[PDB]
Enzyme design. Sequence first.
Site, PDB file in Angstrom:
ATOM      1  N   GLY A  13     -27.811  12.727  59.387  1.00  0.00           N
ATOM      2  CA  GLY A  13     -27.838  12.691  60.836  1.00  0.00           C
ATOM      3  C   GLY A  13     -29.144  12.100  61.312  1.00  0.00           C
ATOM      4  N   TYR A  17     -33.765  12.600  68.460  1.00  0.00           N
ATOM      5  CA  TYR A  17     -34.297  13.929  68.178  1.00  0.00           C
ATOM      6  C   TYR A  17     -35.042  14.016  66.852  1.00  0.00           C
ATOM      7  CZ  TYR A  17     -30.323  14.236  64.996  1.00  0.00           C
ATOM      8  OH  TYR A  17     -29.429  14.030  63.975  1.00  0.00           O
ATOM      9  N   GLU A  19     -34.181  13.542  62.400  1.00  0.00           N
ATOM     10  CA  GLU A  19     -33.232  13.306  61.324  1.00  0.00           C
ATOM     11  C   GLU A  19     -32.861  14.638  60.697  1.00  0.00           C
ATOM     12  OE1 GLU A  19     -35.693  11.024  58.681  1.00  0.00           O
ATOM     13  OE2 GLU A  19     -35.258   9.111  59.654  1.00  0.00           O
ATOM     14  N   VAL A  20     -31.669  14.708  60.104  1.00  0.00           N
ATOM     15  CA  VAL A  20     -31.295  15.838  59.254  1.00  0.00           C
ATOM     16  C   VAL A  20     -30.968  15.285  57.872  1.00  0.00           C
ATOM     17  CG1 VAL A  20     -29.632  17.671  58.827  1.00  0.00           C
ATOM     18  CG2 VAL A  20     -30.494  17.355  61.158  1.00  0.00           C
ATOM     19  N   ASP A 134     -27.294  22.941  75.118  1.00  0.00           N
ATOM     20  CA  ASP A 134     -26.871  21.654  74.566  1.00  0.00           C
ATOM     21  C   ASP A 134     -25.700  21.854  73.628  1.00  0.00           C
ATOM     22  OD1 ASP A 134     -26.686  18.974  74.167  1.00  0.00           O
ATOM     23  OD2 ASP A 134     -28.286  18.856  72.679  1.00  0.00           O
TER      24      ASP A 134
END
EC number: 2.7.11.30
Length: 296
Positions: A13, A17, A19-20, A134
Amino acid sequence: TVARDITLLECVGKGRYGEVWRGSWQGENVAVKIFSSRDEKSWFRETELYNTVMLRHENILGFIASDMTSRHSSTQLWLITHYHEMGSLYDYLQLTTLDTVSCLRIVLSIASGLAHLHIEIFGTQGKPAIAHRDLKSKNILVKKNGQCCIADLGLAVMHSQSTNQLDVGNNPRVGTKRYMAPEVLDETIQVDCFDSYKRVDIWAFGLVLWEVARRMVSNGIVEDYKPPFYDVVPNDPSFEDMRKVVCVDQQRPNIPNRWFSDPTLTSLAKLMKECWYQNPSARLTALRIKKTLTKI
Ligand SMILES: COc1cc(-c2cncc(-c3ccc(CN4CCCC4)cc3)c2C)cc(OC)c1OC
């Protein structure tokens, strides 16, 4: 610090924001979120909620550790959680259709998670009321048992009846535009009232219910996976694209005719419409949704 011991294996991801990554730690997959330098208040808020509040619930993404490490000659902020290989609800809805039991399991376990967030627990083992701000299908993961869990507390707002202190933090981040409630898009939301933020959650949960219901088969057919308002805003809609559609034109997602020929989808259509009232105080509560889904 754990951060230096985790082996980062692949990126699963990436966005503004951060990264994952899927990582290996102590012989297990873990999810490692590496925050963009611009989003440190989110890491601050998530760490606060997971380490100070001890937030833990089968339908909340499970915390492992929070860390500061310097890789690649810079200092990064890491959040490490359980890794759910089935991925996000957003992806899951694209790779499969659902039967009645699987749909209800999904939406009920989301309700369970959101109730747990919204409701204050008193005592030595408790928690303040929490609003997410969110909620979307990319912020929901699908567990192997077919329940889901809610992720990303970086915008959380908290409140306790003990103190009557509304705690909105200091994050300049704002919610995903496609999922913003009418009162956010027209900037009439009452920002000092905690209930306001719970009602923004309920709006977005309605949209997630819509996304899920479309993928439940009835009479041998389904809708394609689409995101809320796919037909009337481009990808990555601006604040003004959403304000025009949701506020000026008072649009809501369309209910497919075939849902009324199936009782579960009829029930679900009734719920999601009561998450979409323009008047925020008129919307259902998380506990009510949970209670109704349980009976369906
Ligand atoms: C550390 O922090 C967070 C981790 C996660 C997270 C946890 N488990 C699994 C995932 C994932 C794993 C794989 C795919 C790919 N798909 C394609 C087909 C199948 C799998 C998608 C998603 C992710 C992103 C989510 C967060 O928020 C949204 C996080 O931030 C709070």
